[PDB]
Amino acid sequence: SDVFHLGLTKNDLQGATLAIVPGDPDRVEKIAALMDKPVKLASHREFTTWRAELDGKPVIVCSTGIGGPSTSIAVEELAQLGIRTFLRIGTTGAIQPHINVGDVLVTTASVRLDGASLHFAPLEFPAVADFECTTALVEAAKSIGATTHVGVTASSDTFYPGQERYDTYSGRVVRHFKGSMEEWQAMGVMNYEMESATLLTMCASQGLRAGMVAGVIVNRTQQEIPNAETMKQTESHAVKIVVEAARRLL
Template identity: 55%
Template sequence: MNSVYHLDLDSEKIQGAKIALLPGDPFRSQVIAETISGIYGTYNRKLAWKREFCTYLAEIKGKRLLITSTGIGGPSASIAIDELAQLGIDTFIRVGTTGAIQEHINIGDVIITSGSVRLDGASTHYAPIEYPAVAHYEILNALVEGAKKATVRYHVGVTASSDTFYPGEERYDSFSKYVLRRFQGATKEWQRLHVLNYEMESSTILTLTASLGLRGGCITGVVNEGGTGKITKESLKAGEENVIKVAIAAVECLI
């Protein structure tokens, strides 16, 4: 029996699952699992919760899948992917929230990442920076079909994936109110380059899965207002609910 340390899982516990949904927030693992059970009338079970890694087992149309939280950022996401791969998972879909930087993108829309700008460090421990962080085409197609099935407005394109929430996303509402020169004006530049959004895990997830010969994808729900950094309880709820609906529909398409 194969076991892994950080996730507190083993090959027996996961019962042959091959697909993993990867929220950042550990409490979202339960929400996703219960949503799946509500839609399909199937069971769900918490397998483990250690540090930021909370894992549930669920079932869609007779196929078991895991919902494992990764915490915030690339380092912990890389641990989750590596250890899940060691247990036999071969398909990974990040299910998160995001801040849009294009004005035509609205609260509650979902962004399907085709590729990521690698503003992280963790991914460079698996592949050099020249290696592209790209989604697997089968996952990308399934996410698009899932959005159509769930009737949720979606956008497909490039994401800027940063190791830090404040300076890396050019936020000036931090403790210091200062952003290093390398990030000053970055948002305007990404906008001009048609980057859709900021988030913190996709570059790691897509680089690892592609370089390891696995299938990876990323879908995020928009939680900010009008291309600004402002997030409210209502906007967060809208983004979370829609991204979960689309992710579940996408898994059904894959199955």
Template identity: 45%
Template sequence: MQPHIRLNTSLTRARYALLPGDPGRVDRIARFLDNAEVIGQNREFRAARGWYQGVEIVVLSTGIGGPSTAIAIEELRQIGVNTLIRIGSCGALQDSLALGDVIIAHGAVADDGASKTYAPASYPACADPYLTATLIQQAKQMNISAVLRAGAQP
């Protein structure tokens, strides 16, 4: 049993995770999955699991900020999750972006406290290119206009 997220392989064998920040969004996301059920709640970490097209997916809130997100990611990796997608809301620096636009980030500025424990700030924090390409492809297939961005682009 992982000490913070309170999950283990008897609760989920998912290899894929969706990570909202807000625990209140876990149930909303889980509604899109088949046979969804809440499997844990501890502090900011609320977890649900379900299936999408026969593939088990875990949804786990991370709370606010890098340290709690790092805890969630490290503990999910300990139970076998190997593909993680952070989903949620963000602010925009560009007037061309509107409320509700879908943004797929392929990179981020890693100039925060938690990231420095993993790599120097000068090391690029980039998303997996194949996963990014798959997200873009799926958005196109669903006729969703998605904007591809890296970090804090003005």
């Protein structure tokens, strides 16, 4: 193996340059399946890697696990192996009342509520998605008919306090984050997730194309924790779009 964590070699990718990077390792095969010649490459820690084929070209699907740090690992090592375009596909909670469960969100840039982005660029550097990628995602989403929102995302190092969830063991939120969701709401931020800040920053600052898309599985103006019932029906929606977007980016 050529890299410390992913257990992959440059040869495994077969000249692949684009990677779809889901968070959950169980979604990896699920995504690979949407393409041709799906092959499992490796599985170590939270990192599961498949190769597949898109219009006759090699494509990598690789999980990041939850959060900046492990994302920063998968991205770095995939880059070492030759990946130049990263498309993230996620699940998110919307914080605007007009965004519905099932809606697809394309992120233009992220509020940096993470730590890892700082290890790549100072806070003043914009966690902005690549223009070609965003265009690919926005268009892909149009062509499959999904009801889509394009905007800024709050990308947090936690699932609980940083997203101002109170229904927690301690039931307090550090002062810094108290009332933070209302502020993000006022600034028109669409949603919370946990990886885009690191992903987008580290790519934007190292000449790597990144895009970010997610399916809404809970609206925060209503609940803190999603219901299981239509979580999978929304997943299948955004996956379709990211694969299509990838097609457009090859």
